[PDB]
């Protein structure tokens, strides 16, 4: 599914010389955001909230009402009028129908007749006459790498904010791009990069990682604080298995890390036995920090999931 198209794009990118894990994560974050994880290879002309969502200033040149009428027509499957407002008379879209014919396609959307002309010439693809080729995953990958290597200067290859600006001349969805960037930085380990260099099909293997219950792993300090305090509660902790105690410690360390605690000094039961509160500092300290977990959900919450979420949280 997404894994197959993501693996294909990772191989195409590394085959084109995008070898830096930092540059590759950035490239993958921009492509993932602009195509919703490589699942949307065609531009959507559907705007359900309002015309304020339409990101092209030029679309208002015929007044607010003509733009609202084109929006309703696009929602009914006739986006020609909206495409003409958004891209007509720009980027080589001279003839009627060009704006929609050359709508965005690909991972780093190719839009406008002149960009289909330039990309076609550079990649030996008949994109002007068969623009649909730009929405085919294989060609889409080659076109995204070309957009990246020709529109992003070397100095902006490692920064999500600068790369987004060099690509789009504006900063849209920076939060979502930053989140995708941090996920790719975690996935592109040395062995994953080595398997991409070797050209392996399933190179992006995640593999079993050590959980926070192992010494030296991210969250281990908070995990041991939680585990010690759970064992101190004795039979009153309501935990009937070592596995449930470990799961609860993992959930507690995660909540603690998310709320800014560096240490769990105390564990308190509350909400009629349904909640566990992790506390940093004495209970009478007005600077005391706190975090809470649902006891039932925490006893069955995977320690591998808790360890993954805490590691990402610390990396953020």
Author numbering: 1 to 316
Q: What text does the study give?
A:
Stenotrophomonas maltophilia expresses a type IV protein secretion system (T4SS) that promotes contact-dependent killing of other bacteria and does so partly by secreting the effector TfcB. Here, we report the structure of TfcB, comprising an N-terminal domain similar to the catalytic domain of glycosyl hydrolase (GH-19) chitinases and a C-terminal domain for recognition and translocation by the T4SS. Furthermore, the SPN1S protein’s apical head-like domain is important for interactions with peptidoglycan. These analyses demonstrate that TfcB shares significant structural homology with GH-19 enzymes and may target a component of bacterial cell walls.
Each protomer consists of 12 α helices, 2–310 helices, and 3 β sheets and forms two domains. Helical bundle A (η1–η2, α3–α6) forms an apical head-like region that is linked to bundle B (α1, α2, α8, and α9) by long helix α7 and loop 2 (L2 connects α2 and η1). These helical bundles connect to create a cleft or concave groove that consists primarily of residues from L2 and loop 3 (L3) that connects α5 and α6 and protrudes down into this groove. The C-terminal domain is composed of a single helical bundle (α10, α11, and α12) adjacent to a three-stranded, anti-parallel β-sheet. Structural overlay of TfcB to that of these GH-19 enzymes showed that residues Glu34 and Glu43 of TfcB align with the catalytic Glu residues of the well-characterized chitinases. However, Val111 aligns with the Ser/Thr residue of the conserved GH-19 catalytic triad.
